[PDB]
């Protein structure tokens, strides 16, 4: 169901997202190589993967993650980290929307995610553009797991349309805005958005649609189990805004399914 190349990208960006959790990658020297403890980003380590910018508890929403250089894969990767304590962030998630006409007409984003990105936007966009002018042939990829996935999605939306395409890869991302924004994320040029979900992960189910939310399309849904290796045949592509054949089904969700995207993610100390 997904080709081997796209699969290898899904696999690779999940490790870039996982790496963002390792505390050592949030305050590391520029030029230094990105490593992960617990054998959690071997593919990133195989590459010539060095830091460009490292950040922690920045702006309003404690924006943590890294901007990386990959000489091997030819990427400039902005990796947004999710919340340090996923369980807690979940149960205290606020569902408020606010208008983001700056990004698109009639669009409303989660107030929290949207404001957090805005906080660090000018700084992070400058760094990204420095890399783009230094490495004009590298492709810009924004990634993240959980709360980082929303950050990457909203950041991609805002920054596209400035001369360089930006692909987004999000792992277990919550819904990020209303219908109009979901339609925007579905058809925006200057990059593709690859929204990946896993079995019955709770996080893509929130905030609830009832609070005025929608998911962009399509959806890359991992059917393989928590703790089980994914193969290219376990990921089905589901098309349609707010589709119900993948993660958005009326069954009980689980927290553990959120921690298993290719390999463990969100757990690196």
Domains of the chain: 1-269 (3.40.50.1820)
CA distance 80 to 115: 15
Q: How long a stretch of residues is the chain? A: 269
Q: Are 161 and 140 in contact (CB under 8 A)?
A: no
Could you tell me the resolution of this structure in angstroms?
2.5
The separation between CA 156 and the C-alpha centre of its own chain, rounded to angstroms, equals 10
- Catalytic annotation, residues: 146, 201, 258
CA distance 112 to 62: 11
Experimental method: X-ray
Which of 34, 107, 114 lies closest to 75, judged by CA? 34
CA distance 159 to 217: 19
């Amino acid at each position: 169901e997904v080709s081997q190349d796209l699969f290898n990208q899904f696999n690779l960006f999940a490790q870039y997202s996982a790496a963002a959790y390792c505390g050592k990658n949030n305050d590391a020297p520029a030029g230094t190589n990105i490593t992960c403890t617990g054998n959690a980003c071997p593919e990133v380590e195989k590459a010539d993967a060095t830091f460009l910018y490292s950040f922690e508890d920045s702006g309003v929403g404690d924006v943590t993650g890294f901007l990386a250089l990959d000489n091997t894969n030819k990427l400039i990767v902005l990796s947004f980290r999710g919340s340090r304590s996923i369980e807690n962030w979940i149960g205290n998630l606020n569902f408020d929307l606010k208008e983001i006409n700056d990004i698109c007409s009639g669009c409303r984003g989660h107030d929290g995610f949207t404001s957090s990105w805005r906080s660090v936007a000018d700084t992070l966009r400058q760094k990204v553009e420095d890399a783009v002018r230094e490495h004009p042939d590298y492709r810009v990829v924004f990634t993240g797991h959980s709360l980082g996935g929303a950050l990457a999605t909203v950041a991609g939306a805002d920054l596209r349309g400035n001369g360089y395409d930006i692909d987004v890869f999000s792992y277990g991302a919550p819904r990020v805005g209303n219908r109009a924004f979901a339609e925007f994320l579905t058809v925006q040029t200057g990059g593709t958005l690859y929204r990946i979900t896993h079995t019955n992960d709770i996080v893509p189910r929130l905030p609830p649609r009832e609070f005025g939310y929608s998911h962009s399309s399509p959806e890359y849904w991992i059917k393989s189990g928590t703790l089980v290796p994914v193969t290219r045949n376990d990921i089905v592509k589901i098309e349609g805004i707010d589709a119900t054949g993948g993660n958005n089904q009326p069954n009980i969700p689980d927290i553990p399914a959120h921690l298993w995207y290719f390999g463990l993610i969100g757990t690196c100390l």
